[PDB]
Amino acid sequence: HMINGSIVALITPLNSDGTVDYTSLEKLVEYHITEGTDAIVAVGTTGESATLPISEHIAVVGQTVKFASGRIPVIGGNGANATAEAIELTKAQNKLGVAAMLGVTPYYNKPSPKGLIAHYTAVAASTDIPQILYNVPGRTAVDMLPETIAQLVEVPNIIGVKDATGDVARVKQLRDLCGNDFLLYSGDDATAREFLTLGGDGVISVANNIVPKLFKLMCDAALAGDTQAAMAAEDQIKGLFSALFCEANPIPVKWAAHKMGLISQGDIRLPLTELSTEFHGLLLDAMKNARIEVK
Amino acid sequence: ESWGSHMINGSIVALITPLNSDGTVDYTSLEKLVEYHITEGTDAIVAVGTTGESATLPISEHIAVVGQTVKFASGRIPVIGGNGANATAEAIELTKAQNKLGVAAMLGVTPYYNKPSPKGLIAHYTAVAASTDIPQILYNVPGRTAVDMLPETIAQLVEVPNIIGVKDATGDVARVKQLRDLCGNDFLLYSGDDATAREFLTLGGDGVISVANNIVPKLFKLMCDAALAGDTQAAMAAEDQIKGLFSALFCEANPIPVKWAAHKMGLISQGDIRLPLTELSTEFHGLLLDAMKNARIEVK
Ligand SMILES: [Cl-]
Ligand SMILES: [Cl-]
């Protein structure tokens, strides 16, 4: 296993015709290598998994692996709200060369704890690739509590959990019920430094899409226990921790990216839409404040 | 008239999708459900919506169920196909696969999980509607989708010719009035929350796409007719008999409880259900069985 520190939930850049832009995707992979990002999640929420059918999903992940050329672990998204669909997505990724897979809890259909367990057990049963669980009730309508996560630790290849609740007290609870070995990632930038400080292993983040160097410093300092340096680094980027959510992720981050020249176009698949004029000002300020160089 | 009456209104069942022991669709139970609803007077059937477990049926199996439900109905009862998706392309695809099935309308939940803005919601439904000429019914259920599509956004779709109304499940009955004042008197309003169905009709809604319909269609029908007719006494008297089910069918996420009930009836042959959903846990068996007795259901 041993993915940790600053993990970027990568956006999927699109051509103005709406197809995947592989030139920008390559630029982004090099960028995270050039700065010091520890891993790349390909096609999760931030990467717009909802709007990418399986064949496109497989392509973006597979291409990201190719561009990385072994220099950085790539983790592929394998979440679905049907167990059978998740298994199929998992099987189609089994030989792309991912280090791991990130699987969100089934959204919309609100299964019970027993069902989440059976769900993830059957998904993990269909692969040798390490699985990371992902709880985000703000999006899924289901809260997968630590008591539930703990019953999955014994599944050989379930290696940890991303938790986006922002509820920092869960770190202790998760440590207590799972082992020291189970990996705990934060999925809430606003509480991340704190999450690591309480004993988290790393952060699967939106903001390190656009401030990876500083986001790395913050994560490394926190893990080392240099709280002063962690807070110091957090200080400069904290503004983005709310600005990148003035409309749902990845609407703002993708605008911020195509703005810094990171990507060729700001195109986004429907039902998602490009960031409203209303927020252009707010986000340019938070961006200039994080020492991001426009234009 | 003008000319043969009935638009889709009144008491509509969000139909259960019955399964065989091996998880395939049970067509003989499906046909039995369709007869049952005809005999008992249900106004219309939504096939493969949430209660029909739409998330765990791939598009092929989805359209077979819709196609067969229409067929079993054989012109005796309107069938509404679910066409909800969180990607526009996927919902266009699903809509197109249902054109020419003999469906009276389609019902499409707002995009879930990905949380589009209102401008995105409009673009989504415009594009879905543009790809068909079957009537479309919008579906708002923030409890499951994590977007709340507000009245003011629904109003901007009223102009889109074949969008005919909205199912609202929030249980905010103040929205009937708001929606009326912004949409037509002609725009169809459906309650999606059984606990507030009666009140929703009484305030000016046109119908209820209900979960409890599955197991108490006669009294439910009675309740909806009466409230539509403005006869509050009979409606309330109808409601009182079955009100207990409006809480008890939600002790686990729908359709887990209703499926158990329908089997324990049993309208179906098997209570099997598809992962990640699981059969009702035994903890709630007594809870639901007694709620069913109080609503006049038998055997047992
Ligand atoms: Cl998020
Ligand atoms: Cl529910």
Side-chain angles (χ1 to χ4, degrees), chain B:
Chain B
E1 70 208 350
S2 195
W3 255 100
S5 236
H6 289 319
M7 265 272 137
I8 284 93
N9 73 347
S11 174
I12 298 155
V13 63
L15 206 71
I16 284 318
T17 306
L19 295 182
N20 303 117
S21 293
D22 60 19
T24 61
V25 176
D26 178 359
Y27 286 106
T28 66
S29 290
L30 180 55
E31 183 177 29
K32 178 160 182 175
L33 285 167
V34 179
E35 293 299 327
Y36 174 66
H37 291 283
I38 289 163
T39 300
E40 300 285 306
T42 306
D43 289 298
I45 299 184
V46 171
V48 199
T50 296
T51 307
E53 288 171 79
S54 68
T56 64
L57 313 181
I59 184 175
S60 78
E61 215 163 3
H62 183 134
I63 77 216
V65 174
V66 179
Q68 286 296 121
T69 302
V70 168
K71 185 197 185 172
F72 296 148
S74 58
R76 296 172 282 170
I77 185 167
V79 175
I80 301 172
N83 70 327
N86 66 354
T88 307
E90 195 179 20
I92 287 165
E93 206 175 346
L94 190 52
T95 306
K96 280 176 174 191
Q98 286 172 290
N99 287 333
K100 74 185 68 82
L101 275 175
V103 125
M106 297 180 200
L107 182 77
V109 70
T110 61
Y112 37 91
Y113 180 78
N114 51 359
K115 268 166 117 161
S117 314
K119 168 90 155 181
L121 282 176
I122 292 147
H124 175 81
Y125 279 125
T126 296
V128 172
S131 72
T132 177
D133 50 59
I134 314 250
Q136 307 290 293
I137 304 156
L138 310 177
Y139 183 16
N140 183 52
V141 55
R144 284 182 176 269
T145 66
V147 252
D148 195 351
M149 181 171 56
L150 299 166
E152 43 282 40
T153 297
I154 300 165
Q156 295 182 59
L157 291 156
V158 171
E159 68 166 65
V160 184
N162 51 330
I163 284 168
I164 56 151
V166 55
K167 172 184 181 207
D168 196 76
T170 61
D172 190 5
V173 289
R175 283 182 204 212
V176 185
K177 222 215 143 219
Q178 293 163 49
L179 283 156
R180 270 298 161 236
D181 296 334
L182 281 163
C183 311
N185 233 72
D186 291 318
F187 204 63
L188 294 156
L189 303 180
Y190 309 96
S191 166
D193 176 62
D194 292 351
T196 52
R198 192 202 54 81
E199 190 179 5
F200 180 101
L201 297 173
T202 293
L203 282 158
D206 306 85
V208 190
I209 302 159
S210 153
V211 169
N213 262 148
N214 279 283
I215 63 170
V216 284
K218 203 190 196 155
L219 292 164
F220 210 91
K221 166 70 156 185
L222 227 160
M223 188 187 86
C224 296
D225 282 348
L228 282 173
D231 176 6
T232 59
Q233 167 151 317
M236 279 187 190
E239 190 179 21
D240 184 71
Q241 191 95 78
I242 52 144
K243 184 171 208 61
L245 290 175
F246 299 166
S247 127
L249 292 175
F250 308 88
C251 61
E252 300 192 54
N254 177 59
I256 296 156
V258 77
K259 198 143 199 178
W260 188 82
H263 173 60
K264 240 297 197 319
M265 234 131 250
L267 302 165
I268 52 196
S269 335
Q270 315 298 331
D272 283 69
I273 202 169
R274 259 174 214 202
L275 276 175
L277 297 191
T278 45
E279 294 177 43
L280 179 73
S281 42
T282 50
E283 169 191 13
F284 304 112
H285 286 198
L287 191 155
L288 193 53
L289 197 291
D290 289 348
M292 283 155 73
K293 301 283 197 53
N294 290 137
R296 313 290 271 157
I297 300 152
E298 64 166 349
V299 286
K300 264 65 58 193

